[PDB]
């Protein structure tokens, strides 16, 4: 009965569509972007990547058992970190740049101290307590991290003590992705049950649940302002969710594409939504009109990860063919 | 125009790339196998002569080849997410319990699920039908009937070409090749030539399954080579 009342409020809320509100705006038209660089030296599939805050540096993880940080401008490998386990579904760079984190099927998040005396990378803190594989790790601050897991629970940790300060438990399936808000006070999770939840880190309870997806939502990202997020699914449709309105405004779908979205990312302005597909091509969507503007196809294998640089300069996409390529 | 510090950084990067290439050549030598079996199938006891909550790993080498065996013991019933990672494996060792007739249909459906998976399409399956001794004991007791679980066994005749082992009853042979025929009948229509199945009858107390895995791995690599050299 409560669910019916909740659905009734959403229906009355929507007076107009984002398409019709948007329709009196100039199209972006056609945008073309060419691969400025390609980063060799990965011997196996690239599962995930994350840009640094400075945006010169990025970290990428692979099945080969190596977590290697790059200098993007010069294409030079800054560090090379032997990984104890070849299974790694995620990597994360701290906002300050001192730490880089790694998570995988071994049920542990490993925190690596990049900057230290003796000039080698060592494991500052190994985090344990999750029953399922860690799908995504993201740093709130240097001292605290949040990890999304396949056991249907997201957790917030503190790195010094190594114990879960809070646990987030409202999902019914594996949590595939986690995306932190710009203000850090709240985050949004995407999970295989096809519902996206808005969590609050301080209170440890779900504020909102959005369910406009038929299939699992693989990847999820915040709009830059922080009042909206976008999801990516095996449905081959990307859906733009709004927090304050509490309903989905827009859906991005085309009849040609039928493959799942591996990764979603937003431009700094928020006009362009970049989506990475299993069909070996990343499609640039005008987020406000749901009209395709271009394709970024230079990968033989699937594009596992996509990331937009903090200064907005670049887009770096890692793919299963082990080559990672900036697209300025 | 590169600074002295930038030249030193490039030298560091080249040394790192050299060490990475050395580790990659070390990694290419070993062969990798994914083990996927239900409980009671004795999946842990497939290999015993020679031998981390998410993955339990056992490494065995026979005749100058290194085999890397991966078993996932820290996941729920549904396996579709972590199965995507194991797409580069040389072969899959699928274990099914022949003795437990109630769970055999579940094993058959699991075989359909693994065989028809999109990521595990090109990979071949080395099938091990375990506990043949227990199957023989059950049919010797005779209370259990395979016909009641599957109607087709009630009218079945053993193939003439198949050679029985010494001391093997014809109805024991009938049941064994019946279960094998069901699994291989799933295998046949789905493959299309990209991969194939290697049905093997394995007692619980069997001295060598490493020799069987090695021979089927050689066959997989040989067929990959025959496909790569444009012979087929």
């Amino acid at each position, epitope marked *: 009965q409560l669910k019916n009342q909740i659905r009734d409020a959403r229906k009355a809320c929507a007076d107009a569509t984002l398409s019709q509100i948007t329709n009196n705006i100039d199209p972006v038209g056609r945008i073309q972007m060419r691969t400025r660089r390609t980063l060799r030296g990965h011997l196996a599939k690239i599962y995930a990547m994350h840009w640094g805050t400075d945006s010169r540096l990025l970290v990428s993880a692979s099945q080969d058992g190596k977590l290697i940080i790059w200098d993007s401008y010069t294409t030079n490998k800054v560090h090379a970190i032997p990984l104890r386990s070849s299974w790694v579904m995620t990597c994360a760079y701290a906002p300050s740049g001192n730490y880089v984190a790694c998570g995988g099927l071994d049920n542990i998040c490993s925190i690596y101290n990049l900057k230290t005396r003796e000039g080698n990378v060592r494991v500052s803190r190994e985090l344990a307590g999750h029953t399922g594989y860690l799908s995504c790790c993201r740093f709130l601050d240097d001292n605290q991290i949040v990890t999304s897991s396949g056991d249907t629970t997201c957790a917030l940790w503190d790195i010094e003590t190594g114990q879960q300060t809070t646990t987030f438990t409202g999902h019914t399936g594996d949590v595939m992705s986690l995306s932190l808000a710009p203000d850090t006070r709240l985050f949004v999770s995407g999970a295989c049950d096809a519902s996206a939840k808005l969590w609050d880190v301080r209170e440890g309870m779900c504020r909102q649940t959005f369910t406009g997806h038929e299939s699992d939502i693989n990847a999820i990202c915040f709009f830059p302002n922080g009042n909206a997020f976008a999801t990516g699914s095996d449905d081959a449709t990307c859906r733009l969710f709004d927090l304050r309105a509490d309903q989905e405004l827009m859906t991005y779908s085309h009849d040609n594409i039928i493959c799942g979205i591996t990764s979603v990312s937003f431009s700094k302005s928020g006009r362009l939504l970049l989506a990475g597909y299993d069909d070996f091509n990343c499609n640039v969507w005008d987020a406000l009109k749901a009209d395709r503007a271009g394709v970024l196809a230079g990968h033989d294998n699937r594009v596992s990860c996509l990331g937009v640089t903090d200064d907005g300069m670049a887009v770096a996409t890692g793919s299963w063919d082990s080559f990672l390529k900036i697209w300025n | 125009t590169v*600074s002295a*510090e930038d030249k030193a950084a490039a030298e560091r990067s080249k040394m790192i790339d050299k060490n990475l290439r050395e580790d990659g050549e070390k990694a290419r030598r070993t062969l990798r196998l994914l083990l996927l079996g239900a409980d009671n199938s004795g999946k842990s006891t497939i290999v015993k002569q020679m031998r981390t909550s998410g993955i339990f790993e056992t490494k065995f080498q026979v005749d100058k080849v290194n085999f890397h065996m991966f078993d996932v013991g820290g996941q729920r019933d549904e396996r579709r997410k972590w199965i995507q990672c194991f797409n580069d494996v040389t072969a899959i060792i699928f274990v099914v319990d022949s003795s437990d007739y109630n769970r055999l249909q579940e094993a058959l459906n699991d075989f359909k699920s693994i065989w028809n998976n999109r990521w595990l399409r090109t990979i071949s399956v080395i099938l091990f039908l375990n506990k043949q001794d227990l199957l023989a004991e059950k049919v010797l007791a005779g209370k259990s009937k395979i016909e009641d679980y599957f109607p087709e066994f009630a009218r079945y005749t053993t193939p003439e070409d198949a050679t029985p082992e010494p001391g093997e009853d014809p109805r024991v042979t009938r049941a064994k090749y019946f279960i094998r025929k069901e699994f291989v009948d799933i295998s046949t229509a789905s493959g299309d030539g990209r991969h194939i199945c290697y049905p093997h009858f394995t007692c619980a107390v069997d001295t060598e399954n490493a020799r069987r895995i090695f021979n089927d791995c050689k066959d997989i690599i040989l067929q990959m080579n025959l496909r790569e050299y444009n012979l087929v």
Partner: single-chain antibody
Amino acid sequence: VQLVESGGGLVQPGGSRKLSCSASGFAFSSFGMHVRQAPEKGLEWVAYISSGSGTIYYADTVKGRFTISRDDPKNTLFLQMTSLRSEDTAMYYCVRSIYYYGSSPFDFWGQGTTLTVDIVMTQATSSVPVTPGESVSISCRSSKSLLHSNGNTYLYWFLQRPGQSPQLLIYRMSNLASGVPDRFSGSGSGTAFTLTISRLEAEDVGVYYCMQHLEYPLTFGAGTKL
């Protein structure tokens, strides 16, 4: 993290002497190693050996008769000198350096051993007497611009307390060295480089050396004693 050294003593001219630097406490293979000091003069660069010994440079005044080799399993590097002369008396410092994006080379220096027998970097070499609590500014000029096209400016400031090997204060004129108090601050435009200190206090009186790193050979400053 230590860098002990051995060898020295009286040596007749034209002889030979092997100086060894045994590192113990860090990953010796990842650090490119390098410096001497006359009895009454500033620091003078000598040589350099890269990671894996893939690159070597020498000062022109010691070219053709100085050799360096590093025993990575032993965690030690040596300096083989032949045809010594009266002007080679100095105290040799074993200095580490690691080169990547955001690194801090010359961070740690050796103890030093007494042995007895281009970009021109200018320092005023005159420093007002030390006054606690009063700001002090030390300026070092350069012959050519040290700001490379990539945007990094290659200046390093080193402080030598009396009776202690010099310590890195600032790397690239704007980035503070690790473990040093925040009061030190460096700034300046091209060819006009300054080091500013606020809230001066004890345990800071020493000689301030300005070093360049745009290209070899590395030329130090004359030094400004407080």
